[PDB]
Paper text:
Here, the first crystal structures from [name] are described, representing two bacterial and one archaeal species: B8FYU2_DESHY from the anaerobic dehalogenating bacterium Desulfito­bacterium hafniense DCB-2, Q2LQ23_SYNAS from the syntrophic bacterium Syntrophus aciditrophicus SB and Q9HJ63_THEAC from the thermoacidophilic archaeon [name]. Two of these proteins, Q9HJ63_THEAC and Q2LQ23_SYNAS, contain two domains: an N-terminal thioredoxin-like α+β core domain (NTD) consisting of a five-stranded, mixed β-sheet flanked by several α-helices and a C-terminal zinc-finger domain (CTD). The proximity of [name] to genes encoding the catalytic subunits suggests a role in methanogenesis for proteins in [name]. Individual proteins within this family display differences in domain architectures, metal-ion binding propensities and dimer interactions.
Molecular replacement was then used to determine the structure of the I222 crystal form at 1.87 Å resolution. The final model includes one protein molecule (residues 1–201), one unknown ligand (UNL), five Zn atoms, six ethylene glycol molecules, eight acetate ions and 129 water molecules in the asymmetric unit. All three crystal forms show zinc binding at the same two sites, suggesting that these sites are functionally relevant (note that two of the three crystal forms, C2 and P42212, are devoid of exogenous zinc in the crystallization conditions). The I222 crystal form also showed four additional zinc-binding sites, which are likely to be attributable to the presence of zinc acetate in the crystallization experiments. In Q9HJ63_THEAC the zinc-binding site on the NTD is situated on a loop connecting the N-terminal α-helices (α1 and α2). The UNL is only 1.8 Å from the S atom of the conserved Cys61, which is consistent with a thioester bond between the protein and the UNL. Two significant structural differences between Q9HJ63_THEAC and Q2LQ23_SYNAS involve their metal binding. First, zinc is bound to the putative active site on the NTD of Q9HJ63_THEAC, but is absent from the NTD of Q2LQ23_SYNAS. Second, whereas the structure of the CTD of Q2LQ23_SYNAS shows four Cys side chains within coordination distance of the Zn atom, the structure of Q9HJ63_THEAC is atypical for a treble-cleft zinc finger in that three Cys side chains and an Asp side chain are within coordination distance of the zinc. A FATCAT search of the PDB shows that the structure of the zinc-finger CTD on Q9HJ63_THEAC is similar to the individual treble-clef zinc-finger subdomains of several eukaryotic LIM-like proteins.
Author numbering:
A (entry chain A), B (entry chain A): 1 to 201
The structure:
């Protein structure tokens, strides 16, 4: 698709399912990383995107936006988390210096004020779909009015290296349940391929 | 957005970036899991989706489709991989029996024949965007012509339990670099919060 809501494609909101400040921020961050790199969105498996967040962080919606803006998705094996707890992305394409993008602390301080209504709802436990548009639309409008430079900082990293997980497409029927199992995940039980649930159980 | 290409929303293809058989299969699987469960797409953080694939499996594009169909995304903390190497999903909403959906081996055998052109290109190393439409469009048309029952099997699991990762939104300025760091990922160095890169380096 192709049409914008608060400067973010409408499709990105349909993927994510709701309006919140972090998915747009992640989208903006991913777009900015590409602009800096002089790259277009990734259609295939060439460029890597690493988020500095961890699974324990709230606001992981940032990662949906980042994947959405760059085409470096978790499913394609191009998106991963480093676990540092920072609102930052590292775009890396082998043979080039990686680009790190960080959301400014000063932007975060202003977002806390600007989006206090939205965050008060979230603190009480209301899911984003239950939050009134008046509490979120002005925040997204504000974010869309800012230049990339007002939200983010960046730098090139010199010695960055990253080797992704080695992938394998071969499959074999599990000896116990009969289901096709990717060889990479099959266990051997007396010379026969067995899926993990049947091996360990 | 809202318009279909081969029975899959056009937006899902823009997110993923290219045409391949597995993203649509994952989309179909996720949609079927919801239909069986009697649930609508997840706008927020209520339902969990677990893929039985691992990061070492080729065809992880299945996972983009699954997230896209269900609204159970990796960014929202609702999507995870179990690492069994099966083309299967488990939809789970606390207080109900989980639903497991498996892509039939027989469907996989027919896909190998039906999509031999596409897979020959992939075996040579051509990325999906470089593959001619004639090698992929008839495969997607075929998939759209099949009923859910022709592609998948399902079952309810009785004793399924899953506790997601405990999340925390609090942040503190790292004592060394000054960057806001989610407390959940901060290290303590003589009573001061330090981000992992500054702690370990
Ligand atoms: Zn969100
Ligand atoms: Zn910074
Ligand atoms: Zn107010
Ligand atoms: Zn609620
Ligand atoms: Zn098995
Ligand atoms: Zn794909
Ligand atoms: Zn089966
Ligand atoms: Zn041919
Ligand atoms: Zn190529
Ligand atoms: Zn630090």
């Amino acid at each position: 698709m192709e049409k914008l809501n608060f400067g973010i494609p409408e499709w990105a909101f349909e993927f994510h399912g709701h309006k919140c400040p972090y998915m747009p921020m992640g989208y903006r961050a991913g777009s900015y990383a590409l602009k800096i790199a002089g790259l277009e969105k990734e259609k295939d498996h060439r460029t890597y995107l690493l988020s500095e967040m961890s699974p324990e962080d709230m606001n992981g919606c940032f990662n949906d936006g980042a994947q959405a803006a760059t085409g470096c998705t978790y499913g394609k094996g191009l998106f991963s988390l480093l676990g540092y707890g920072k609102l930052a992305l590292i775009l890396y394409r082998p043979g080039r210096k990686a680009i790190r993008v960080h959301v400014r602390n000063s932007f975060m301080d202003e977002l806390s004020t600007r989006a206090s209504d939205f965050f008060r709802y979230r603190k009480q436990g209301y899911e984003p779909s239950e939050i009134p548009a008046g509490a979120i639309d002005p925040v997204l409008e504000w974010i869309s009015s800012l230049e990339d430079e007002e939200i983010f900082e960046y730098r090139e990293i010199d010695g960055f290296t990253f080797e992704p997980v080695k992938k394998n497409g071969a499959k074999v029927r599990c000896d116990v349940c009969g289901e096709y199992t990717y060889e990479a995940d099959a266990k051997l039980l007396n010379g026969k391929p067995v899926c993990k649930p049947d091996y360990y159980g």
